[PDB]
Design a protein around this ligand. Structure first.
Ligand SMILES: Nc1nc2c(ncn2[C@@H]2O[C@H](COP(=O)(O)O)[C@@H](O)[C@H]2O)c(=O)[nH]1
Ligand SMILES: Nc1nc2c(ncn2[C@@H]2O[C@H](COP(=O)(O)O)[C@@H](O)[C@H]2O)c(=O)[nH]1
Ligand SMILES: [Mg+2]
Ligand SMILES: [Mg+2]
Ligand SMILES: [Mg+2]
Ligand SMILES: [Mg+2]
Lengths: 218, 217
């Protein structure tokens, strides 16, 4: 993933990355190597932010003292399906590289809650939401409020792969931001049009003429 | 991921991979570079198996002819949560390298906890991506259910790990990355009460660690 990537155009005028054409792409927001550089650095930022904190001991319920973040009481990561699963898969491995014990549960929402968390012991825990992109801010603002009210974690913060601060309509600022995008619809590396393009290794601005390309329900 | 990993033992006799100690590990099943080599080879295998197949056109429903596998009508991948999500993340990008259009939806089972949201699977080629087959009961039941309820044109299973020595029902995955003995493994998607899931290598767990984390998450 961290081999340098070469952006160009083919003879048809389509964007290429490393010689492969992407007819749906207007431009390149970030290539694979750029994305993974930001994720590795972000994992270290996260390790540094969390590794000395303490929170409620649920490994041993007979204990009353707050406990360090360990395999016994790891950082709780809430990963928002579907858009975050690839991002989360790469991030948790880089967090392992940095020695930060964590466990992952998923929640699936619209942008409301389709699939609930199955972790039940979040009160008094350090909890980190891993989310694909913040645009108007409304989805995360609502999710953060929901988790805070239902569980009352010791802390609740958001890490996004991409922030689009130009789209904000509510006051919402993710504590941790890997990449920033212009105020456009992006696809690639988790981002999709009706699930297409999600498995690409780079993030692109979608051509407007592709926005309605796959209207048939899956 | 694909530079060869060094496997050793530290002064305490614990397994090391690239200088990092894993006290919960009895031994290494496969390191990261080996796993990713097997996944890249599997992605080519999958692309060869599917690239020329034809299935129902739901992109243009006015077309009665079967249609090739394309962005318009991709391979449907069902990924089994939670155990398959890292395997699936890596595999779909290798499938992209091999030019096989695909889309992923998730099903959560433990019993079915969270159903698919895709609904239009009739007459589609569908591939299940799963972490490990042991007794085979889990996949035998999932396959029967998907066949019955969705009626795909074809339904196959790709597992990261097969433990054929544990097979005790009529189930055989079509596509297998790695084959392992009948031992409990952890790392790279495999866990003990969610621990060790984010490690980059697959290990045999020490039996002493099997009950290390009894408390509900
Ligand atoms: N694929 C894609 N989805 C986006 C983009 N911007 C926002 N989203 C979607 O909208 C959600 C956030 O919406 P918000 O509530 O912040 O406006 C994201 O989680 C994602 O589903 C984008 O540029 N590309
Ligand atoms: N972590 C881990 N899980 C296993 C192992 N073997 C079987 N499983 C679990 O059991 C499920 C399938 O079991 P089966 O129904 O084939 O016996 C897997 O999806 C996984 O949850 C193993 O060696 N390690
Ligand atoms: Mg998401
Ligand atoms: Mg999504
Ligand atoms: Mg699970
Ligand atoms: Mg699974």
């Amino acid at each position: 993933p961290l081999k340098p990537n070469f952006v160009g155009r083919d003879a048809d005028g389509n964007v290429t990355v490393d010689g492969r054409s992407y007819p749906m792409a207007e431009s390149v927001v970030a290539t694979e190597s750029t994305i993974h550089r930001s994720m590795k650095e972000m994992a270290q930022t996260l390790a540094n932010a969390y590794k000395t904190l303490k929170h409620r001991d649920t490994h041993n319920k007979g204990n009353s003292a707050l406990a360090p973040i360990t395999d016994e009481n790891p950082l709780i990561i809430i990963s928002v399906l579907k858009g975050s699963y690839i991002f989360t898969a790469d991030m948790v491995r880089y967090l392992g590289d940095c020695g930060l014990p964590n466990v992952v549960d998923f929640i699936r929402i619209t942008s409301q809650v389709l699939d609930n968390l199955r972790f039940t012991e979040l009160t008094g825990k350090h909890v980190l939401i891993m989310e694909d992109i913040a645009d108007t801010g409304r989805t995360m603002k609502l999710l953060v409020e929901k988790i805070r009210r239902e569980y009352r974690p010791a802390s609740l913060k958001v890490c996004v792969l991409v922030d689009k601060p130009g789209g904000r309509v509510v006051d919402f600022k993710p504590e941790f931001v890997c990449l920033t995008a212009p105020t456009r619809y992006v696809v690639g590396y988790g981002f999709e049009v009706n699930d297409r393009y999600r498995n690409y290794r780079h993030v692109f601005v979608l051509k407007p003429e592709y926005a309605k390309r796959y209207p048939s329900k899956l």
